[PDB]
Structure 1
Amino acid sequence: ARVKRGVIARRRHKKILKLAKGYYGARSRVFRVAKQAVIKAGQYAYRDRRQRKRQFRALWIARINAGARQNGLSYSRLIAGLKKAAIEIDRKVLADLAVNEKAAFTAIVEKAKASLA
């Protein structure tokens, strides 16, 4: 029973060249280059799921820091001010209140100053 492998080879090639479209020049059309650029673009997508969490945390912090100097503190004395008391608020929703809801942020900052920390 001779089997000829010309039809199940083709389905596995088109499955690679579908994930690798949108690429420059010869990385999106010939297979011995488009197999390397599919594996490499899967390692980057694995590392950058962790680095996504670090690029926003560093963006939330630098927005609280700018907004809390305009009222009269730093960032680092504010976080000790909220944790002298118990307010229990993330960085994600402080940096929303810094931009959009600016009057509610000032009513938070005055309570850290009353906490005197």
Structure 2
Amino acid sequence: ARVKRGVIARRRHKKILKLAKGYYGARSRVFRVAKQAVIKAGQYAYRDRRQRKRQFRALWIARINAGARQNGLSYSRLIAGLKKAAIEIDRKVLADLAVNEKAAFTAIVEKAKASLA
């Protein structure tokens, strides 16, 4: 029983070369270079699911700082004031109100201020 490798080997190389679509030069058309490019792309994607959550908290916090100082308060003093009174609203929701619903953000900043913080 002699087994020939032609059909199975070709099917396996085409799966890798389809994931390497859009890469530059030999990274999208030769198997040896495209195999390493696909592995490193998956290494980056695993790490950047952690970094996506970090990059978005930093963006919300920076926008909350800009909106609070327009009402006479810094970010660190507003967070302490919110925790003092009641509020559990996310940084994600807070950054949305700072840009879109500016009259609601002012009310929250004014209530956090009234907690003497």
TM-score bracket for the superposition, by shorter chain length: over 0.9
Shift of 1:51: 0.2
* Secondary structure of the corresponding residue to residue 28 of structure 2: coil
Show the counterpart of 1:101.
101
Shift of 1:106: 0.5
Aligned-partner Cα distance in 2 for 1:84–1:32:
60
1:53 lines up with 2:53 in the alignment: yes
Shift of 1:110: 0.8
Aligned-partner Cα distance in 2 for 1:111–1:3:
77
Show CA shifts across 1:32-78 (max 9, x none): 10000000000000000000000000000000000000100000000
Shift of 1:113: 1.2
Give the aligned length: 117
1:39 lines up with 2:39 in the alignment: yes
Q: Which 5+ residue runs of structure 1 have no aligned equivalent?
A: none
Shift of 1:86: 0.9
Aligned-partner Cα distance in 2 for 1:107–1:57:
22
TM-score normalised by structure 2 residue count: 0.99
Aligned-partner Cα distance in 2 for 1:107–1:3:
76
Show CA shifts across 1:7-54 (max 9, x none): 110000100000001000110000010000000000000000000000
TM-score normalised by structure 1 residue count: 0.99
Q: Which 5+ residue runs of structure 2 have no aligned equivalent?
A: none
Identity %: 100
Shift of 1:5: 0.7
Aligned-partner Cα distance in 2 for 1:36–1:110:
55
* Secondary structure of the corresponding residue to residue 99 of structure 2: coil
Q: What is the alpha-carbon root mean square deviation over aligned residues?
A: 0.5
